Design an enzyme around this catalytic site. Structure first.
Site, PDB file in Angstrom:
ATOM      1  N   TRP A  35      -2.221   1.338   0.404  1.00  0.00           N
ATOM      2  CA  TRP A  35      -1.132   2.084   1.028  1.00  0.00           C
ATOM      3  C   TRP A  35      -1.407   2.140   2.523  1.00  0.00           C
ATOM      4  O   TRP A  35      -2.523   1.865   2.998  1.00  0.00           O
ATOM      5  CB  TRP A  35      -1.035   3.507   0.457  1.00  0.00           C
ATOM      6  CG  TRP A  35      -2.342   4.188   0.470  1.00  0.00           C
ATOM      7  CD1 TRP A  35      -2.928   4.821   1.536  1.00  0.00           C
ATOM      8  CD2 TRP A  35      -3.267   4.288  -0.613  1.00  0.00           C
ATOM      9  NE1 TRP A  35      -4.159   5.315   1.175  1.00  0.00           N
ATOM     10  CE2 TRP A  35      -4.391   5.004  -0.140  1.00  0.00           C
ATOM     11  CE3 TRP A  35      -3.253   3.852  -1.943  1.00  0.00           C
ATOM     12  CZ2 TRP A  35      -5.486   5.286  -0.945  1.00  0.00           C
ATOM     13  CZ3 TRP A  35      -4.338   4.132  -2.739  1.00  0.00           C
ATOM     14  CH2 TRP A  35      -5.440   4.844  -2.243  1.00  0.00           C
ATOM     15  N   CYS A  50     -12.013  -2.883   7.260  1.00  0.00           N
ATOM     16  CA  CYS A  50     -11.147  -1.991   6.489  1.00  0.00           C
ATOM     17  C   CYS A  50     -11.650  -0.556   6.485  1.00  0.00           C
ATOM     18  O   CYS A  50     -12.761  -0.275   6.019  1.00  0.00           O
ATOM     19  CB  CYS A  50     -11.033  -2.468   5.038  1.00  0.00           C
ATOM     20  SG  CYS A  50     -10.007  -1.362   4.009  1.00  0.00           S
ATOM     21  N   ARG A  90     -12.032   1.701   2.684  1.00  0.00           N
ATOM     22  CA  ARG A  90     -12.930   1.277   1.622  1.00  0.00           C
ATOM     23  C   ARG A  90     -13.527   2.390   0.757  1.00  0.00           C
ATOM     24  O   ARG A  90     -14.282   2.105  -0.167  1.00  0.00           O
ATOM     25  CB  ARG A  90     -14.065   0.440   2.209  1.00  0.00           C
ATOM     26  CG  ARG A  90     -13.650  -0.947   2.604  1.00  0.00           C
ATOM     27  CD  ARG A  90     -14.814  -1.687   3.221  1.00  0.00           C
ATOM     28  NE  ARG A  90     -14.974  -1.390   4.645  1.00  0.00           N
ATOM     29  CZ  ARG A  90     -16.089  -1.630   5.324  1.00  0.00           C
ATOM     30  NH1 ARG A  90     -17.128  -2.151   4.695  1.00  0.00           N
ATOM     31  NH2 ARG A  90     -16.172  -1.352   6.626  1.00  0.00           N
ATOM     32  N   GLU A 146      -0.425   2.183  11.365  1.00  0.00           N
ATOM     33  CA  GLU A 146      -0.164   0.770  11.133  1.00  0.00           C
ATOM     34  C   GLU A 146       1.305   0.419  11.344  1.00  0.00           C
ATOM     35  O   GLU A 146       1.627  -0.661  11.848  1.00  0.00           O
ATOM     36  CB  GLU A 146      -0.550   0.383   9.723  1.00  0.00           C
ATOM     37  CG  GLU A 146      -2.034   0.268   9.491  1.00  0.00           C
ATOM     38  CD  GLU A 146      -2.337  -0.282   8.111  1.00  0.00           C
ATOM     39  OE1 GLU A 146      -2.400   0.506   7.132  1.00  0.00           O
ATOM     40  OE2 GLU A 146      -2.498  -1.515   7.999  1.00  0.00           O
TER      41      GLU A 146
END
Ligand code: HEM
Ligand code: HEM
Ligand SMILES: CN(C)CCc1cccc(OCc2ccc3ccc(N)nc3c2)c1
Ligand SMILES: CN(C)CCc1cccc(OCc2ccc3ccc(N)nc3c2)c1
Ligand SMILES: C[C@H](O)[C@H](O)[C@H]1CNc2nc(N)[nH]c(=O)c2N1
Ligand SMILES: C[C@H](O)[C@H](O)[C@H]1CNc2nc(N)[nH]c(=O)c2N1
Ligand SMILES: [Zn+2]
Lengths: 407, 411
Positions: A278, A106, A109, A283
């Site tokens: 979000w 991720c 973070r 993506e």
């Protein structure tokens, strides 16, 4: 034993000690690296609980206190007594934030400690689950000012009474296999969309139909539920240059809420733990819109730009890909929905990475997932060496329910 | 033990049995992955098994495993090891080794071409001047007037570690970089340190933005010497953009022959420490890394200005847009001049096919995803969704320390 990581763009070197506290395994050996592979009882449980409580009381500067020792004793008893145990509210919150903190894949973070935890451990039913989720969606969406959230349903007991959200995300568009042989809507969600109909969903066979929720409580059969449309915030996609863009009839939802993972805290397994943040722009723009196995609109977009699609070397795919992503970001920001661009995000991650090295002695990171799927080498994470290892608490994959469900 | 990899775009699943023949280590453990780490005098005691392992492979590939030719060669080499503490490879063996080191290069996206490597044997070379002559012949042959051919020139193996042949340059052809007193850099920043050494060793630097570095060549452990590659041998391509007339005015050009010269070629325990090799460029090597990296020519800004891009918010993706135009220019300029080059879509596409074929016929293909995936447009190339297994096979290309850090100066 004390590892180092160089950034080859800035010569900066960080030292990693945190990896020494790694419990789980990686997939790799001294003989073979699997870094690019997508998916690599009373006695078991107490050391697990102990590890967690040890790091918990360590974080609140009460390592070795009476409170600490008391708690260890209390949980020991409960495990010995009940063959499981229950987390204090404070521990649950801590474990969730740390499962996010430890997610090596991720990039987002830096936000980790600012996580809202909804405790849905008193939930008993699929209608219950639906209520908790609607509340999650409304809270996190916040009229476009997105807030990170996780909602935690009861922990697994004997694997017979599992809570599961069958959707892969709370909010995803439908996927129908056609007589034309093509695929209408979202190809990733075809098999799901079927099981929806297999349990009775009245599919309005469209292209951007918000899927129904399919919730399983206490190991029972899953039930369908429709998320109130006014809680599903969507963004019409338009290019700040090409007026013809809107004619492609594209929208995407604002809330990314992953709901098929398993949250592990001190040996306890939370099989239903939908969580959200979000989007990073790419993506949707790169993976959701342009992937071959998805909405794959690249040709169409390039066609309307009239790029020379005769030869790969014109880099027309590249040219379009950027425009598409510029638009995604454009629309979202226009409509005041939270979104981050891969440039800003990766930058923020290098900062977070430095903070974690400084304040914790490390930060596990999976370069294959941290580097965005476009413009890789013009972001700062590209030249960042990373170390990948598994800390706990953690988010883990788990089998798709239909494959497991004792019906 | 079998291992399966899956392609998540096509659901194609492949099985790797070849990793079972892996010798060297990766840097990883069960507890930690270092797949994104850049860099993760040998006794007879250990040499023969290495020779045997190599010779066995070699004789299998020519379909003579356990033949008499095979066994006498094992005996010949054994005898030469205990006699001379090392051994010499036949030409047939050297060629095979070299092709296979390439074939085993887990980071190389161009491996489909691995069998068409032209191998020049420079193992009779004794001096720096001799090295220069061999290198010039390499450059001329490889370039072939823009129609590039794969080549590698191989200088004598290492013996006691004290008589190494080295090419001090990281690539045979490269532009100088000069640090200025104001902190700015004229030329290629990647080459600043190396340029200084050259200047120090006597080089008379023209001090422009595109000066072709001189070769700095070490023979038999002696101090390295300077030589200037004949300019007529150095093929260069002026960079222009097909739609943008102001692009030509950026004053950019690049060389056509990518020729890496600082690596180490390991065959059968033998160590070839000067082994310059060459292919042709994938466009993004120049277009993305060589121009747009912050630590390189860093032309993103100026190209963006001239495109009139909203450079105020990074959310405008001005960096992305300009990056693409620059890469379009690079491919255009190269194809216009009929200088061999490949785009990242074609190269990654070809690799997937090479890989699939390697699984069928060889039972695996070691691949480093972090390096195979191109530095832009990653996910719209087929390799992105391709799972890969990384492991080290010999013969292999290895890194070695920069010679200026280890060299014992004679004077
Ligand atoms: C708030 C802003 C956030 C951003 C911008 C972000 C971004 C991302 C991205 C880009 C990925 C890679 C997925 C892909 O490439 O499609 C990812 C993966 C992941 N995220 Fe974050 N995320 C955020 C918040 C969160 C939160 C709140 C959680 C959980 C509490 C979380 C947990 C994870 C996990 C566990 C993965 C790995 C998923 C897997 O292994 O398949 N993230 N995230
Ligand atoms: C002929 C066309 C070739 C193409 C298109 C090509 C392409 C590439 C690229 C793009 C890289 C990564 C470099 C970077 O990302 O900056 C690479 C790495 C590499 N190539 Fe190839 N290459 C070719 C020929 C060769 C040849 C002829 C050899 C040896 C005989 C070779 C051996 C290697 C090795 C050992 C690496 C990894 C270097 C390292 O570990 O740092 N390549 N190749
Ligand atoms: C299980 N595999 C078939 C799919 C795994 C996969 C593929 C592509 C992207 C993935 O990302 C998951 C993921 C998890 C959490 C997220 C949180 C926020 C955010 N913006 N994206 C997030 C994305 C996972
Ligand atoms: C030692 N590190 C600091 C840098 C090593 C490095 C970094 C980036 C690219 C590199 O390229 C190696 C390399 C080797 C052989 C090649 C052959 C052909 C080609 N087109 N590129 C090739 C590229 C090496
Ligand atoms: C930190 C990381 O190992 C390093 O920057 C790598 C990343 N991936 C790369 N990939 C390619 N193809 N070439 C490179 O030079 C690098 N650099
Ligand atoms: C084959 C490879 O493991 C797979 O395609 C991965 C690569 N890296 C990724 N990185 C991110 N951020 N998200 C992904 O889905 C993937 N997919
Ligand atoms: Zn690894």
């Amino acid at each position: 034993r004390f590892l180092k990581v160089k950034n080859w763009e800035t010569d900066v070197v960080l030292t990693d000690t945190l990896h020494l506290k790694s419990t789980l395994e990686t997939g790799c050996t001294e003989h073979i690296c699997m870094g690019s592979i997508m998916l690599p009882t009373k006695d078991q449980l107490f050391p697990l609980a102990k590890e967690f409580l040890d790091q918990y009381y360590s974080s609140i500067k009460r390592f070795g206190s009476k409170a600490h020792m008391d708690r260890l004793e209390e949980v020991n008893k409960e495990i010995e007594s009940t063959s499981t145990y229950q987390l204090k509210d404070t521990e649950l919150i801590y474990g969730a934030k740390h499962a996010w903190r430890n997610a090596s894949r991720c990039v987002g973070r830096i936000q980790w400690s600012k996580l809202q935890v909804f405790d849905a451990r008193d939930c008993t039913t699929a209608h219950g689950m639906f209520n908790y989720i609607c509340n999650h969606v409304k809270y996190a969406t916040n009229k476009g000012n997105l807030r990170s959230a996780i909602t935690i349903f009861p922990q697994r007991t004997d694997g017979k009474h599992d809570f599961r959200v069958w959707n892969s995300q709370l909010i995803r568009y439908a996927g129908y296999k056609q007589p034309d042989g093509s695929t209408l809507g979202d190809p990733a969600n075809v098999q799901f969309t079927e099981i929806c109909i297999q349990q009775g969903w009245k599919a309005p066979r469209g292209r951007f139909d918000v899927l129904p929720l399919l919730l399983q409580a206490n190991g029972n059969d899953p039930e369908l539920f429709q998320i109130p449309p006014e809680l599903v915030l969507e963004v019409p996609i338009r290019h700040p240059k090409f007026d013809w863009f809107k004619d492609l009839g594209l929208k995407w939802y604002g809330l990314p809420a992953v709901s098929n993972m398993l949250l592990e805290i001190g040996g306890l397994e939370f099989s239903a733990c939908p969580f959200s943040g979000w989007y990073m722009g790419t993506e949707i723009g790169v993976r959701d819109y342009c992937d071959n196995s998805r909405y794959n609109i690249l040709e169409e977009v390039a066609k309307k730009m009239d790029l020379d699609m005769r030869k790969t070397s014109s880099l027309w795919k590249d040219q379009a890909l950027v425009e598409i992503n510029i638009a995604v970001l454009y629309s979202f920001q226009s409509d005041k929905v939270t979104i981050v661009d891969h440039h800003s995000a990766t930058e923020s991650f290098i900062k977070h990475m430095e903070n974690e090295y400084r304040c914790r002695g490390g930060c596990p990171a999976d370069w294959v997932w941290i580097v965005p799927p476009m413009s890789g080498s013009i972001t700062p994470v590209f030249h960042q060496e990373m170390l990948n290892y598994r800390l706990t608490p953690s988010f883990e994959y788990q089998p798709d329910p239909w494959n497991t469900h004792v019906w």
